[PDB]
């Protein structure tokens, strides 16, 4: 909600292609395989 | 350089085939991950 009026320092644009069912696997607590080898996602992932 | 016991093919392929269902379609993803260091990004509104 506050994205429209919030200040950000710098961005990293990271682009890739995954499977359709792997999109819902991107969630804190959900299981998956991307988080370890293709893209590192911390549980405090500051991004969108 | 040979296949067999304890020696498998190093690479695996994503299962994208025509018979795949709706949930197995390729989704392209772009992620803007924000880091702090010089803050040239603000909000339009």
């Amino acid at each position, epitope marked *: 909600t506050k994205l429209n009026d919030l200040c950000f320092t710098n961005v990293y644009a990271d682009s890739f292609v995954i499977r359709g069912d792997e999109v819902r696997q991107i969630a804190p607590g959900q299981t998956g395989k991307i988080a370890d080898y293709n893209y590192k996602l911390p549980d405090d992932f500051t991004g969108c | 350089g040979v296949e067999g016991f304890n020696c498998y*093919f190093p690479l695996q392929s994503y299962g994208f085939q025509p018979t*795949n269902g709706v949930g197995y379609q390729p989704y392209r993803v772009v992620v803007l991950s924000f880091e702090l260091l010089p803050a040239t990004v603000c909000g339009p509104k």
Partner: antibody
Amino acid sequence: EVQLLESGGGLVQPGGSLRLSCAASGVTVTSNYMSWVRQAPGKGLEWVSVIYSGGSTYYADSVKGRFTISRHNSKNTLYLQMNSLRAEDTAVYYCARDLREAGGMDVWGQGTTVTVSS
Amino acid sequence: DIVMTQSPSSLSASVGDRVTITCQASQDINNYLNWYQQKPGKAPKLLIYDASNLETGVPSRFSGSGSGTDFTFTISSLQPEDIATYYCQQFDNLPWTFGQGTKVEI
């Protein structure tokens, strides 16, 4: 050279602590996939837990908080201490060197059963 | 989640009859189903992986096929060694739940 031997198992009571362990040689548990799996009597196989490369722990639904996993490269061993057990847990357990998706559980050992009878 | 509702669980036939195993899945499995030979009381032994390739050691009397919803396992030459429980497993959608398997006994 390479070998995955099993240790532990018995007749622990429900809610009673026990220690299952898989000792590996020829691989590295910390930086490679390895897994533990159960097989219930009269039922098919059931996935339990995995250890990945990079300090990422993933468990099944029923063993999310009941098992405790810890790995060591000194002897290439994986330990799971199980406390607060349930009676249904009686089943034959295996430690496996799962290698992603190229045919699941291609290599088998012996496997040890755990009876949680009173 | 992908769950398979395999109708047959324990079928009995005479010696020499064909063995046809069909394993239906809720969602589409993309060339990613396995067929094992587990034997009475013994540990499962994997025969067919990735739904199309044969492993060195598997007898020629076993065949597996399928790419999608439908998956088939065929045994033409019935033997007493084939009295076992054949399982269908989907290593496709996390979590990778195992199958129940149909038990053939002659």
